[PDB]
Amino acid sequence: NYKPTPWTRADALKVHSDDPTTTQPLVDVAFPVMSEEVFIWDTMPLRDFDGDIVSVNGWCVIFTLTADRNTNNPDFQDENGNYDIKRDWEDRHGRARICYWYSRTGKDWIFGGRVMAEGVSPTTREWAGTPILLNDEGDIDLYYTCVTPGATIAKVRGKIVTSDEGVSLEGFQHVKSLFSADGKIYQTEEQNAYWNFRDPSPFIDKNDGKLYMLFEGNVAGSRGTHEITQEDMGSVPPGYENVGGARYQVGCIGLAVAKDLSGDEWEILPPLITAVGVNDQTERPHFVFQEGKYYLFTISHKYTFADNLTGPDGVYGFVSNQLTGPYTPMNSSGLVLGNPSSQPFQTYSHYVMPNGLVTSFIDSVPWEGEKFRIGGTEAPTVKILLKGDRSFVVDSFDYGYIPAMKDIILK
Ligand SMILES: [Zn+2]
Ligand SMILES: [Zn+2]
Ligand SMILES: [Zn+2]
Numbered sequence: 001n002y003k004p005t006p007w008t009r010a011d012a013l014k015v016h017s018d019d020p021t022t023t024q025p026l027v028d029v030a031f032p033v034m035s036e037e038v039f040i041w042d043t044m045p046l047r048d049f050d051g052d053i054v055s056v057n058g059w060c061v062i063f064t065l066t067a068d069r070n071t072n073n074p075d076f077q078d079e080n081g082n083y084d085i086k087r088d089w090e091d092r093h094g095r096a097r098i099c100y101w102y103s104r105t106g107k108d109w110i111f112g113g114r115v116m117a118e119g120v121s122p123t124t125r126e127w128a129g130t131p132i133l134l135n136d137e138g139d140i141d142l143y144y145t146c147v148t149p150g151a152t153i154a155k156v157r158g159k160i161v162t163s164d165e166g167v168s169l170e171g172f173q174h175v176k177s178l179f180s181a182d183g184k185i186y187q188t189e190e191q192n193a194y195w196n197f198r199d200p201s202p203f204i205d206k207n208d209g210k211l212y213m214l215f216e217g218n219v220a221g222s223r224g225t226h227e228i229t230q231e232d233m234g235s236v237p238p239g240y241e242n243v244g245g246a247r248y249q250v251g252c253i254g255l256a257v258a259k260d261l262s263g264d265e266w267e268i269l270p271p272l273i274t275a276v277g278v279n280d281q282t283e284r285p286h287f288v289f290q291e292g293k294y295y296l297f298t299i300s301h302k303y304t305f306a307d308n309l310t311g312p313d314g315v316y317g318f319v320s321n322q323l324t325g326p327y328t329p330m331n332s333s334g335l336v337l338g339n340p341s342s343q344p345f346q347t348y349s350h351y352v353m354p355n356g357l358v359t360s361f362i363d364s365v366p367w368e369g370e371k372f373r374i375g376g377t378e379a380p381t382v383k384i385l386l387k388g389d390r391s392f393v394v395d396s397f398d399y400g401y402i403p404a405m406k407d408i409i410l411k
Contacts, residue, residue, distance in 0.1 A: 002324035004274045007334055008234025012278050014333035015311035017341050021392045024314065024337055024382055027346040029365050029373060034109060034400060039092055039376030040064040041361045042128040042349045045402050049204040051287060051354045054133050055404035057162040060106045062402055063115065063131045066099040067092040089374045098126045098144060102167035106403030115142060116156060116172045122146050128284065129200045138410050141263065142172065143200040150189060151197040152180045153215060179266050186254055186268065187218035196251065201286045202263065205323055211261050214285040217254035219276055226250050228277040244307025246277040253285040253298055272296060273318055273327060280304040288354045290386055294320045296327060297336065297352045302344060312338030315350040319389050328389050336391050337382060347379040358382040359402050
C-alpha cells in the first residue's frame with residue numbers, strides 16, 4: 001500500500017537548539033502551581049475528530065494525567081523525615097490517573113476529579129491518549145493507554161453534563177481494549193522489555209471518510225537486531241558514518257484504521273514515520289490539518305536520540321500533502337519547538353493545536369546551585385505559525401491557557 005517515511009540521521013544532523021523561531025521561552029523559575037494537592041503532566045484537551053478544541057455550553061475541558069502530591073505522606077520522607085519531592089515526582093508514572101478540569105476562560109482551571117472510578121481501568125495505571133467529543137448529546141470516547149501488565153490501547157465511553165456552576169463527567173464505566181503491539185509491524189514486550197506502545201490520537205480523514213488513529217510504537221524486531229539501512233542514514237556528510245549503538249533506537253509513529261466509524265475494531269497499518277537509527281521515542285503523535293496539508297507532530301527526548309546525534313526535548317514535526325506520505329521534516333531538521341539549553345527540561349509533552357497554540361507541563365527548572373525545582377503544573381502556552389514546511393514562534397500566553405476553537409451547544 002505505502003511505505004513509511006524515515007526521519008533520517010541526515011535530517012537529525014540539522015537539528016539546532018536555541019533557534020529562537022523554534023525555542024520555547026524560558027519558564028520563570030518562580031512559576032506558580034495550579035494545585036498544592038495533585039501533580040499533573042500530560043494534558044489532553046477535549047477535541048472533535050479533526051483536531052478542533054471544543055468547549056461544551058461555554059465550558060472548556062482538559063483531561064490530565066494526575067497523581068497526588070505526597071507532601072505529608074511518611075512513605076515519601078527522606079531519612080531525616082523530610083518530604084522528598086523528587087522521589088514523589090519521579091514515582092508518578094506508577095500512580096497515573098486521568099482527571100478532568102474545566103473553565104469558561106481556558107485558564108484558571110477548576111478541578112473536576114477522576115474520569116473513571118478507581119477499578120474501572122483494566123490496569124491501575126491510566127496513561128495518555130485523547131478525549132473525543134462524539135456528538136452534541138455530550139457523549140465522549142476517552143481513548144487512552146492501559147499499561148502494566150503490557151501496553152494496550154483502549155477506550156471508554158461516557159457523557160459530559162454542564163450547569164451554570166461547572167461540568168460533570170459521568171458513565172465512564174466500560175473500558176474496551178482495542179489492540180496491543182502485534183510483533184510484525186510494531187515491536188512487542190517479548191521482543192524488547194523496554195518497548196514503546198502508547199498514546200492513541202484518533203482522527204477522521206475526510207478524503208476517504210475513514211476513522212484512523214496515530215500512536216507511538218517501535219519498529220518490530222528483537223532488541224538490538226535492527227539493521228540501519230541507507231534509507232535510515234539519509235545523505236550524511238563525510239565523517240558522519242559512525243552510528244555507534246544507533247540500532248537500539250527504533251521509534252515510529254504508528255497508524256491504524258477502524259473497520260467502521262464506531263471505532264470498536266481496528267486494523268494495524270504500517271507506520272507513517274520511522275526513526276530507526278535516530279530516536280527511540282516518537283511520543284504523543286498528533287495531527288494538525290491546515291490548508292489541505294497533513295502536519296504530523298511528535299514529542300521526543302534529547303536522551304532518546306541515537307549515538308552521534310542530538311536535539312532538545314520538545315516537539316518535532318513533519319508535513320505531507322497526503323495522509324500516507326511522503327512526509328518532509330518541519331524546519332528541515334524536524335524540530336518545531338525545543339526547550340532552551342539553559343533550562344533543557346523545563347517542560348514536556350508539548351501538544352500543538354490547530355489554532356497554533358502549544359501547551360506543555362513544567363517538569364524540572366534549574367533553581368540554585370545544582371538544585372532543581374519541580375513543576376507538575378501547566379507551562380505558559382506558546383503560539384506558533386505554520387507556513388509551508390516551516391514554523392515560527394510568534395506569541396506567548398498565560399500558564400495553561402488552552403481555549404476552545406468552537407463551542408458546542410448540547411441538545
Ligand atoms: Zn472540527
Ligand atoms: Zn445530536
Ligand atoms: Zn527528556
